[PDB]
């Protein structure tokens, strides 16, 4: 890239995501990666982990425009990932989700615009597509915020777009680390609905998606990566095989209310989108979900799993 | 009632709604009805229309807590109707919709709580059920706000609940005044989808719904009125007959994107609700919509229409 | 003009005034007219009335600088008309009048200055000349605000000036629509003081005044249009004659406290002003009022009245 | 009094006024006098001057509600004197005058109300009667603010009223210290208009006025003290005589724009007022001015002057 | 206790400290422990760790008074531990340290006072005693904030006090986990200054200190626990012995600038303090440091170390 | 200079300091000196004292960014002296000291940066070196604020540095005016500790120090002037001799807690500083104090004293 000599700021950068971005990009021609957040602890661990003079750490938060403006000054590109992203916590403190997810984004955009930042990519979730919960509601509203802003601001000034992705394999919310635990534990693997589906997205896929929008999105665009899926039963089988393990699979029936599949595009959006090859693009103005994609055989699932670092490390140590 | 000697504040009260509330209640035992809003013009017209010493008018807005606190002081009950409620305007200015619909409600609740207001009823829309647009998104988030607040505040202190209703017949967004215009004009009546459906709700029904929640809702409850529906074709036929008119009905096909039906309860909510007789109640935690209610014959539609003042006035004058 | 290819923003634009400005200018070489205000309803009616792609509508208010900044971006000229302008409403909510009329103007100026807007014209009232009521007090303070700002900011940067005018014939506060009603009603016309006087200003005159300041005012200037006046008795006579009507004039004596005349310039200001031909100009630092101007015969009053659209429409329909 | 065991807060208390209040009241049964302002220097001098454990000093300002709330906690009565009171400074920084004089008062009232303060007396000026300048405009608007608040708040809760007085003899703006200087200097005394008039008010009179409102005003009342006046020529003569001095009086003609007389009540207010004996009272809803009061002979002027401490000290030392 | 049926809020509760408090108190008669902070992740882990219905988690931060007020409502006692506590991060973002450590505390106090919270204990650091760095400076200023507030607020209302402690053994900043790592690693243990000293404080000691202030501090008090110390050389020897390990100790000389000892009380404070038995108390108005306490033999150090859970777990596993 | 045609703003300019700056610079080639503060009284006296069209006065305060921005517009250099500088007042209202000394400076820097001001010099105190009191604590934190800002902002943009000086001879806190009073009074001179020491700094020295930083400091630098000192006993002797007076010196012993000496540089800072000739410079990252400088004989003290205007005026008049 492309990032040659530029300065990238990542809000919410002390995450899984920020970390993936740093691995892939730190040793590039990029001039700096700034990590903007409130947690001095995590920032310190990350500092000590990379010992890199291009990692710059800024204390502040997206609800605090002052603290944003300091982080933003001289920045070329922003990946905007800060958010209150857990369902119960948005459901109990929706004002907090509003201040962080929605007003927080507004703050980021305004600050980037004022600093003449070239591009902002706002990360969103599959849960913004059929907003059912407070986290998802806040996220859908966040997308209306950047989409609205993008109309009023020339592209050549600041380009503003976003992405959606869902479950990341082996991340916090992934069932993979729970399954592998249970294998190592000599425990049964508990499935509720074995045909419940997720798109298959690793951490690198997600970073590749934001990079794609970074390169190719028009202002106002929502960008989504084409991805196969798999049932969770097929995934539990793929893992047992990988680990040459024989732990009882205990199928227990639907926990009444769980997400059956992941919707990345609604009927409405899919009807409007551009097929770009490996990505769909929804320009600023049946459904694309994990049940109606290419669903993977146990064997192909094994192949995907094996491109996962977290999975390779578990497999050696075992 | 029940409102005997009490003080009711209505935000967004310079509306259709506020006006209905005043007609029904002004000549009661209520001590005052305060009308809280920014528009001095409308407040003045309403003042001159009723010439009633119990109508008190307060200048301010829900984004301005100071101005709320003044209106709130000594208030018993609040019907919280202020909102930015039009689709394009929320879609172009979603921050504004956030500040008004979501933070604005937070302001109202906080102020009412501090003033020891007994009850707040937050009006919502059918569009909060499957939030697809920015107005609907803001509204669904508003409901998460009151529902969250209601958990943290004792009922005996302030009770906090809300209602949903959809299209009101012969109101601003109703197709009735457009149809009647076209009759009087000697014009065709243009239908896009003749089987598109709306619940049948007059203005008095809506006021009766808020009154019901006022009397019977628990804190955290969303309350919805059971109502028949009708197709728009059947409605265009009922009107032509009422007016003994013979204007060509021009059926033109779906305008690609229009709301086909009204959803008052989602699969999820309907699954959780209590049937109360004439109302469903969703307690703080397939679908109820206008296609799967009692749908009305042309003849029953005529009967409903005739309970409408706006319709009776048009019918005499013609 | 002159407005060729420029972008004009009008706060308080959903008014009588904004509407006059749009009629006169929409079909010109102007690139856009933006209408900035909180009321989505009115904005929507105006949208539907003109069906013009150059009318741009912005939701926000002058107390909210964020929402101003969005409206202001890339704007060439501002006519600043937003205000809380009714006497009782300023008298009961003077803080609200302060926030809107005075701080609101400060917000507008600051935002325009930051956006490099070329010119701001702040509309004021005859009531700022001898501020007796809260509305008038707020308005006089508003003029001190723009006048002060204009000293600190180079003209070539942003020019800042204002206008005063009083009663507009046939507008909301005009006695003309009440008189014409009474004619059509077969009712008496009630006068309190028949020699009470108003300057004679139509809506087009007012728009012409702002246009004049727009073209010719120096920064810090207050601009006022020279206008004849008439007693209200003479005006009631002119109307009866126009309508060839014979309704009893009931003269009832002064309502104790009413405005006897309109003061556009104080002794002090008139002593400082420049006579410009058709306008007086008060540069940033006996009286000019409706009793000591050219007062009109019944016959000349008829001629003025007839240049009024509102009057021409009433006269045909009758 | 009456102030027995109570706590009085004085904003703007580091003044002439605050000092007069402290002299008269410190050695009483009052429990504390709190002096609220931003200037640590003056507060320190006053501390060192009285060495009194009942003088409590609070740092903050009326624009800062936090800092007010701290000063207000447990307070019984407030004399609200903080203000930006000089003409050029309000004329150049009217926003500052607005924030201090008008919003600042709002802050004070709100804070006092919340703390259950029994009484607030807001000091105003003769210049609020025919507001011609920015200071006077801000002051008239301040009176609308307390008058409005007083309507909404029960008397038994917080009583809110104000006073007006004009020139205080021998204070900062008084011509007395300039005349006496000129006497001691062997210089001429320069008069512009010898018949220009001021009410005759000493510092003790002013404190007596606020005390009167404190005791007898209803909420919403403006209170004014009846006072004789004198021309300035008569005053220059009275002083020369007192000092048995023979300095040339140089009469130089009106400086074009100077205040000729002091208006304490407008035609409008005087028409509404209650004569209370030694005070007029304007209840919340020709003129009383220094030309139409009892005007004093040179001999009576000498008698008034001699009740002045500042005058007695000059007279001994000379 | 004592905490029987009460509600305790802990800001900064997702820490080492908050965790210690929960272990010791969760299984008591306490009615709730609320954990107030911005990090949903940590709050979620802690939720899953204790599975206790008395742990309540609140999202918000101390810079956000709204979010505090929600957490504070009905609270009996507060342990105020939220802070930006790392040296470089305060040194690079001192405004952030100010907003969090100083204004943040002000917010907490104000909110607790308004909610009638009985007691607030503000945790401070040894580094507030001779503030040399930005973190220490912010902390000393924090103590002036609570000490000032405590003067103005009756004890019986809200009692406000604080504590200081320094290094906690085996916590984040402790050298113990680095030494034990090096043992297990077969690595040398690197000492810079072997006679550099720390007070010996475990996590339980710290919790016992706050509990002590909770029970016995007067309002305005700073409370400090009496504790022995040890050199780091003696500590490295005690560990090697415990682990029956023989790793080379590499003494490397002072890193030029490191903290040689810990000062809990200055000359000034120690001169003012009350010796309470096991604690010193500094009432609201040579030095006590780790060099001039009871310094421990290698053998006594071993005994202290062994009362440490972190040390016992390492010792078994090895 | 150097100040030729430039515009200098002085916050806290109504002081001793601001006055010294005006004397030295008003009659230069400087284009304007703006004096920014809240006190209209002092600003008015200063206006009347110099009658200079280059003195511009701005009303506002450093806590109010709006009011700063107005003062800052087009400014070349800022000497930032506004502060709450007295010990008891910071000790009783530390929040106020925080808002003024620390956030206030942040405001100033931000505003200057945005206005492209070339240089800001922040005045600090010797008391920031071993912050023991709330005023000193606030001041040390202020230095961390400018030092942090200076790292993030290019020098060529805005240079940001500060100075420290201690007691100014014959200023408010100087013992000189108390001694001279006592001489003229025929009173004893009371000393507590005769060997207590202060650096010897006149008002001109201080202004020369800020000027030096103005010319030569790098961004982030703290600058301090090399100065001799004297004991207070030696100073009391020098004065008695100057005045050829024989008043009893009453030595009374240390008031337990008084400042024995002045520390301008800590061990730490002195270890880092650059000796510049007449100044030390601490670049952005045993002790220098009044006991270990060149201490002056009674005779040299007399010579210093005589370069003091305040001393020369007392000496003539006596
Ligand atoms: N003869 C007259 O002076 C006269 C005539 C007519 C009316 N009045 C009215 O009576 C009052 C004047 O009393 P005075 O003559 O003693 O006035 P003064 O000498 O100007 O004192 C007024 C005080 O206001 C304080 N102040 C200014 N802004 C403030 C803020 N934001 N917060 C807190 N304190 C503030 C100042 O204290 P710090 O600098 O310590 O903050 C000052 O000592 C004014 O309200 C005025 O309208 C006076
Ligand atoms: N040995 C020591 O650590 C030590 C030594 C001396 C003094 N102290 C004092 O004791 C306290 C430390 O306890 P600890 O060691 O457990 O600290 P910790 O591990 O840093 O935890 C402190 C907590 O503060 C929370 N926090 C930070 N900023 C916040 C804000 N604006 N609002 C709400 N919460 C916030 C964090 O929670 P979230 O990330 O979830 O918001 C964090 O878990 C500090 O106040 C410190 O001054 C500690």
Numbering used by the authors:
A (entry chain A), B (entry chain A), C (entry chain A), D (entry chain A), E (entry chain A), F (entry chain A): 0 to 284, 305 to 337
In the authors' words:
The two reactions catalysed by CapE are the C-4/C-6 dehydration and the C-5 epimerization of the UDP–sugar. CapE consists of three well-defined regions: a Rossmann domain for binding the coenzyme NADPH, a substrate binding domain, and a 23-residue loop peripheral to the protein core. Herein we present the first crystal structure of CapE, revealing that this enzyme forms a stable and functional homo-hexamer.
Two structures correspond to the binary complex of the enzyme with coenzyme (wild-type protein and inactive mutein K126E). The level of NADPH bound to CapE was essentially constant among all muteins as estimated from the ratio Abs260/Abs280. Firstly, individual residues of the active site and substrate-binding pocket were mutated: Asp125, Lys126, Met134 and Glu257 were changed to Ala (Lys126 was also mutated to Glu and its crystal structure discussed above). The muteins K126A, K126E and E257A where completely inactive, demonstrating the importance of these residues for the functional binding of the substrate. The structure of K126E with coenzyme bound was chosen over the equivalent structure of wild-type CapE because of the better resolution achieved with the mutated protein. The latch is not observed in the two crystal structures of CapE with coenzyme bound because of dynamic disorder. The coenzyme engages in a dense network of non-covalent interactions with the enzyme, including polar and van der Waals forces, and hydrophobic interactions. The A–B and A–C surface areas of CapE in complex with coenzyme are significantly smaller than that of CapE with substrate analogue bound. The reason is the dynamic disorder occurring at these two contact regions. We note that all the muteins eluted as hexamers during their final step of purification by SEC.
